[PDB]
Amino acid sequence: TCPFYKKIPGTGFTVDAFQYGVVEGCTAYFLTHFHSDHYAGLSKHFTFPVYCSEITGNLLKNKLHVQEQYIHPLPLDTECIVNGVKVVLLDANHCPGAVMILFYLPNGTVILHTGDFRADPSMERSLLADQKVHMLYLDTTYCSPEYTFPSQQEVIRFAINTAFEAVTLNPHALVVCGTYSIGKEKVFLAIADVLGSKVGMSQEKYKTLQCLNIPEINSLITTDMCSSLVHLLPMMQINFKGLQSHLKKCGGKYNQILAFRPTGWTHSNKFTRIADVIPQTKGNISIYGIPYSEHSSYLEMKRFVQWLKPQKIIPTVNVGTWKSRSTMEKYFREWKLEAGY
Ligand code: NI
Numbered sequence: 001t002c003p004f005y006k007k008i009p010g011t012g013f014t015v016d017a018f019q020y021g022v023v024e025g026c027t028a029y030f031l032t033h034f035h036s037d038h039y040a041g042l043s044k045h046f047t048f049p050v051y052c053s054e055i056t057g058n059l060l061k062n063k064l065h066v067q068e069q070y071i072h073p074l075p076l077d078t079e080c081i082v083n084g085v086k087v088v089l090l091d092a093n094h095c096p097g098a099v100m101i102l103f104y105l106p107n108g109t110v111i112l113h114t115g116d117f118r119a120d121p122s123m124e125r126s127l128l129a130d131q132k133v134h135m136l137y138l139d140t141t142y143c144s145p146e147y148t149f150p151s152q153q154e155v156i157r158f159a160i161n162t163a164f165e166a167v168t169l170n171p172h173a174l175v176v177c178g179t180y181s182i183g184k185e186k187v188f189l190a191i192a193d194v195l196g197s198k199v200g201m202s203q204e205k206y207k208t209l210q211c212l213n214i215p216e217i218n219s220l221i222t223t224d225m226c227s228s229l230v231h232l233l234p235m236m237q238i239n240f241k242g243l244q245s246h247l248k249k250c251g252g253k254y255n256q257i258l259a260f261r262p263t264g265w266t267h268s269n270k271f272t273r274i275a276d277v278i279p280q281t282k283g284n285i286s287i288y289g290i291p292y293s294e295h296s297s298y299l300e301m302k303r304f305v306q307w308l309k310p311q312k313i314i315p316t317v318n319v320g321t322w323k324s325r326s327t328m329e330k331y332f333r334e335w336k337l338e339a340g341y
Contacts (some may be wrong), residue, residue, distance in 0.1 A: 032115025055097025
């Protein structure tokens with residue numbers, strides 16, 4: 001049954017609540033972003049209103065074949081009325097088309113649902129700064145101080161440099177980049193741009209990336225694998241067997257693979273700097289796991305909340321164990337006491 005943390009009080013609304021069937025008393029279903037754990041449930045047979053970003057609307061229509069009469073895309077940064085309630089959608093700094101939702105209840109309560117996000121100081125100058133927020137439904141994915149990671153920019157620099165050096169040393173080396181959902185597109189686009197290649201990929205993937213409004217996209221991606229020296233594969237294939245296989249398929253065009261796995265966090269982060277990252281190598285194949293995160297670090301989360309000063313915090317990730325809940329409530333209380341709200 002739909003859990004409490006996916007329900008918005010004083011409304012007919014739910015958030016990311018498509019896998020419970022008809023939810024008693026839900027008049028509109030909000031979808032923060034196109035990741036499977038959040039859209040699980042949607043298909044062509046859905047006949048309730050769905051509210052979401054334009055990009056999320058492109059993917060619903062094209063990938064899951066939702067009928068257009070049921071997709072209600074909204075512009076970001078704009079006050080809109082849905083079943084008599086004022087709402088705004090804000091950039092969540094997550095994957096393309098990912099949003100946070102502000103709800104302005106009739107009674108004067110204000111609710112912010114972050115959906116999934118990576119907190120940034122740039123958010124401190126959106127429409128959030130203009131009024132008080134009473135309740136916050138918080139993406140707590142990395143709510144613990146062991147979770148530190150580098151900026152997205154330093155990680156991309158590491159990857160551009162690594163790849164440019166490899167292929168310049170050996171122009172017969174192929175670069176591979178794993179994917180299994182939208183997001184983290186900058187990894188493979190920035191590598192391809194420094195190497196003066198297009199990124200080649202399967203048709204289903206090319207379809208997906210065409211839904212995202214990325215500027216100059218036709219210039220950067222292709223389904224012609226042959227003309228490309230940066231290839232995207234499913235994450236599951238990013239291993240020595242999967243990569244020997246793919247190298248066989250390229251017909252003596254290449255003699256070396258350099259491959260990249262964007263992971264969220266890996267415990268090498270507590271000890272190791274981004275400068276210091278090394279690959280796993282077998283023969284003529286090397287695999288780099290790089291810490292490219294689209295969720296908040298513990299410090300970026302703490303700073304956001306301390307800035308926002310919510311009256312109540314409702315965690316939406318890691319809720320399923322008592323030891324996790326308890327740990328999180330401790331940190332919420334720490335942050336409050338430290339900042340004085
Ligand atoms: Ni997500």
